[PDB]
Amino acid sequence: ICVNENGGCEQYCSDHKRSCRCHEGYSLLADGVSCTPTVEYPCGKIPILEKR
């Protein structure tokens, strides 16, 4: 599943059945695919643009 469209995952994907995972500083949402920041400065996000 993971090799096609990232297995639907926003970030990381493991074949097992399919499990999506998120980088440190993020947590996986109940949709099982989306990652949301858990810290103020998660990697790969640009604060001044996140603000707008």
Binding site: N6, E10, Y12, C43, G44, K45, P47
Partner: protein
């Protein structure tokens, strides 16, 4: 960077400036609060290993605005397979003496998992390259941080579309053969950063090229995906006395 634009201040917050005795040496990429990824070749001519400095939150080299954070480079880790004065395995992992503080102006780029990078990120066409390198081949370096959108090529396509070193599995091409847009030697070590679903990831390091923005040539970048496990293992390791460390690859 040739043919790009000023990176608006804070929009390239993972960019690192490396200094040797206060002089510009290379760029790099912050990947968490104490670790920086750069190019091994940046260290080929290091006189005093104890005088290496990494600057985060830098933007305009002519001024201090207070967002800059300077750290000594405590360790430079280079893979066993890299040979000084050559191109293959062009990667260095730098440990800062003290963590930087994350701020709106200082943020790590995500180091992706290998599979995600190979299966997904490798097929995102455009990525950003940045640095305070030459604005023209044989020209002056930039005072403000510059950034450039470049498309990636599969290596067979790169060779087909190009008019000296071999392009290995540890490298990839990105840029333009019309001589309009490229990174340059002063950008060596800096990020090639790839966006995917709202988040940016480290996919390449400014490595080499035939001049810069040379007609019939593309920029060549270290293919970071080959090094994910090597980096992750080292980041879990205890520091060792001495700055330089050669670490087995794979």
């Amino acid at each position: 960077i040739v043919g790009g634009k000023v990176c608006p201040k804070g929009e390239c917050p993972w960019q690192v400036l490396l200094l040797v005795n206060g002089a510009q040496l290379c760029g790099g990429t912050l990947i968490n609060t104490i670790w920086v990824v750069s190019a091994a070749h940046c260290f080929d001519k290091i006189k005093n290993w104890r005088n290496l400095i990494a600057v985060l939150g830098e933007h305009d080299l002519s001024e201090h605005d207070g967002d800059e954070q300077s750290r000594r480079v405590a360790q430079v880790i280079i893979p066993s397979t890299y040979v000084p004065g050559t191109t293959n395995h062009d990667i260095a992992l730098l440990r800062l003496h003290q963590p930087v503080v994350l701020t709106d102006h200082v943020v790590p780029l995500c180091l992706p998992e290998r599979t995600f990078s190979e299966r997904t990120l490798a097929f995102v066409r455009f990525s950003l390259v940045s640095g305070w390198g030459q604005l023209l081949d044989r020209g002056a370096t930039a005072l403000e941080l510059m950034v450039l959108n470049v498309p990636r090529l599969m290596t067979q396509d790169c060779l087909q579309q190009s008019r000296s070193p071999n392009i290995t599995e540890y490298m990839f091409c990105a840029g333009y053969s019309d001589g309009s847009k490229d990174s340059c030697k002063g950008d060596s070590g800096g990020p090639h950063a790839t966006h995917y679903r709202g988040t940016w990831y480290l996919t390449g390091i400014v490595s080499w090229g035939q001049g810069c923005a040379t007609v019939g040539h593309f920029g060549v970048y270290t293919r970071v995906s080959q090094y994910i496990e090597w980096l992750q293992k080292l980041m879990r390791s205890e520091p060792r006395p001495g700055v330089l460390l050669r670490a087995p690859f794979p």
